[PDB]
Design a protein around this nucleic acid. Structure first.
Ligand code: MET
Ligand SMILES: [Mg+2]
Ligand SMILES: [Mg+2]
Ligand SMILES: [Mg+2]
Ligand SMILES: [Mg+2]
Ligand SMILES: [Mg+2]
Ligand SMILES: [Mg+2]
Ligand SMILES: [Mg+2]
Ligand SMILES: [Mg+2]
Lengths: 207, 36
RNA sequence: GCGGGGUGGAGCAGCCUGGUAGCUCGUCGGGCUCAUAACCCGAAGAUCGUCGGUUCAAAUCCGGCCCCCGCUACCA
RNA sequence: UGGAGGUGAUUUAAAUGCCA
RNA sequence: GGUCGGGUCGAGCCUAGGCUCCGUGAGGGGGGAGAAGUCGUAACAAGGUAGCCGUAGGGGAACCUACGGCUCGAUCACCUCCU
RNA sequence: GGUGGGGUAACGGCCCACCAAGCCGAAGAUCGGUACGGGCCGUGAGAGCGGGAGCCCGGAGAUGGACACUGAGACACGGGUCC
């Protein structure tokens, strides 16, 4: 419980049933598990990346403050989520921000805390040995850049392209920033195979 | 674009307006496209 | 719990309202242009899964059987 | 003698062509 | 001549420092030339909707619409200006 | 650039201590790129254009880089040291 409590989300939904009156209205539920730290109902927090907005003519996001409306694992009553299991955290936000798995792989930490966001990300990557998950296993090629590859950041994900392809690391340009609580967090690279994006290396994010 | 008006004559080529517009879609690119 | 079509090479039209598989892409061939494609028209073409019932009489109304099987008990 | 300017009008469906 | 001190000019070496001198080298986007491959008809006449320039938006491709300008645009009706 | 000084055969920021803000620059500063210069040769109607190995008067190197001895004469091609 030393680094910043981060819940690396996997699900996010809206409790409000179709036809719910404006009196028992709820925020959204956002659901992960507490690996570093512990989260609590009514706590100040910021979610990342969350919301994207047009600020000065380019593309960028907004880390979003709130507090928790309740915490639960299903159907029992508790109030402060400790480590262990996908915990569900219902918040004070808008629900339309959360439905349809918009922020799949969200991250939650404190609205007074530190997790960075970078359009250009440097990642030390290790090549995979063969085409694992497929019928057919062909050689792993040393490539040049400009190819478009899928980079999944822990529970986050993005596309990426590059201009300097160093031997061991990669300087990838994106369209959406990262959720990187500290060093060498596990973001994985997959290359298209026949519409199936399979592994071509495991990388760790240096910042 | 520092016009050179020998090209509009449309003789053995294509219109000029609709070539300018397409060169923009590549200069805007090699400027944006990892030309950073 | 069920429940649906049970249709030509292909869209299946058409089913209580009952006699002409009903047009449409496609296959043969005939017309127009110089010649092609578009365009025009004859021909092929299944005959309603199938055993039946009801029905003077049928996919037309009702059932045996079976083809394929399409919806059966999620919001922190 | 020939223009030199202006206002209006100005019509279904009609694709393409080896060889010296 | 020698040896100790002090001072003096000075190559090389050596850390670290970006610059320029490169054998290469990893995906690339175009580019020039082959016009019995494939897709369509925008350009030339009033080219079957007139064309062509500046900005903007869209589009499997040549291309299409939106306001402001010129004849390097053809006829009928009608004027008006001069010779 | 100035005052005042040591130094070489000799004047000189050539070097030294003091004193102040001067110097050049789009009539092309600086930095990059190429070349040994001058008598002259090649061509051309002439106006030019292009070349300046071979002969003579200049200027510089002695495997790269540094430094001294001797003599009028230089840091010495067939003399001397160090890297
Ligand atoms: C998006 S939170 C997911 C966990 C929730 N309690 C279910 O069940
Ligand atoms: Mg001209
Ligand atoms: Mg024909
Ligand atoms: Mg028409
Ligand atoms: Mg045309
Ligand atoms: Mg036209
Ligand atoms: Mg004008
Ligand atoms: Mg003096
Ligand atoms: Mg120079």
């Amino acid at each position: 419980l030393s680094q910043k409590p981060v819940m690396l989300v996997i699900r996010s939904f809206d409790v409000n049933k179709p036809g719910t009156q404006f009196n028992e209205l709820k925020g959204g539920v956002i659901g992960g598990s507490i690996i570093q730290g512990l989260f609590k109902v009514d706590q100040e927090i910021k979610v990342l990346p969350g919301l994207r907005v047009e600020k000065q003519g380019k593309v960028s996001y907004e880390p979003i403050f709130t507090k928790i409306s309740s915490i639960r694992f299903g159907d029992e009553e508790f109030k402060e989520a400790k480590p262990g299991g996908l915990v569900a955290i219902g918040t004070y936000l808008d629900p339309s921000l959360t439905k349809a798995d918009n922020l799949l792989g969200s991250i939650i930490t404190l609205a007074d805390a530190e997790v960075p966001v970078l359009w250009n990300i440097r990642i030390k990557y290790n090549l995979l040995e063969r085409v694992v998950g497929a019928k057919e296993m062909l050689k792993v090629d040393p490539i040049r850049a400009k190819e478009t590859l899928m980079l999944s950041v822990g529970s986050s994900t993005t596309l990426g392209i590059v201009t300097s392809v160093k031997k061991d690391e990669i300087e990838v340009e994106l369209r959406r920033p990262v959720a990187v609580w500290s060093n060498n967090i596990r973001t994985v690279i997959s290359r298209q195979i026949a519409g199936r994006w399979r592994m071509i290396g495991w990388g760790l994010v240096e910042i | 674009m520092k016009r050179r008006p020998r090209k509009w004559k449309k003789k053995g080529r294509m219109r000029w307006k609709w070539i300018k517009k397409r060169i923009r879609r590549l200069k805007r690119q090699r400027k944006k496209e990892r030309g950073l």
